[PDB]
Amino acid sequence: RESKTIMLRGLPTTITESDIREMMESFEGPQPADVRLMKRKTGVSRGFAFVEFYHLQDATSWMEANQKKLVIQGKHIAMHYSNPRPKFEDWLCNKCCLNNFRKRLKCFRCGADKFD
Ligand SMILES: [Zn+2]
């Protein structure tokens, strides 16, 4: 599927949330609605981030304009579409498309992780 939210996987753990957002600027395409680096309970990066866009085509054009040019520290970064993952709100599973309660960490149907 295609969506407004974009999942960047395999990011170097040494990379901070400010390093990403500054790099998000000066990129081609519509500037995103938000840039979300997922961190640990200690605060260290979990290695993946969420880049949300306002409309659908702003995400596809950004996916189209950067699915070859997103290299950081020499390592290519995987780029996948993802259902919206906003703070506090409900989330649709990416593996079985079921809508889950917001406080649910694992999926109700297939048990897939919220960020899997
Ligand atoms: Zn599921």
Residue numbers in the entry: 4 to 119
Question: What did the study's authors say about this model?
Answer:
RBM5 comprises multiple domains, including an arginine/serine rich (RS) region, two RNA recognition motif (RRM) domains (RRM1 and RRM2), two zinc finger domains (ZnF1 and ZnF2), an OCRE domain (OCtamer REpeat)32 and a glycine-rich domain (G-patch) at the C-terminus. Notably, both of the RBM5 RRM domains are non-canonical as they lack the consensus aromatic residue in RNP2, which might impact their RNA recognition. To study how RBM5 recognizes cis-regulatory RNA motifs, we investigated the roles of the three RNA binding domains (RRM1-ZnF1-RRM2), which are connected by linkers L0 (7 residues, between RRM1 and ZnF1) and L1 (20 residues, between ZnF1 and RRM2).
We crystallized the RRM1-ZnF1 construct and solved the structure to an overall resolution of 2.4 Å using Zn2+-SAD phasing. The structure shows that the two domains interact via a hydrophobic interface involving the β-sheet of the RRM and the very C-terminal part of the construct. The crystal structure of the unbound RRM1-ZnF1 tandem domains shows an unexpected conformation where the two domains are coupled together. Nevertheless, the RRM1 and ZnF1 domains are coupled together in solution in the longer constructs, as seen by comparable tumbling correlations times derived from 15N R1 and R1ρ experiments.
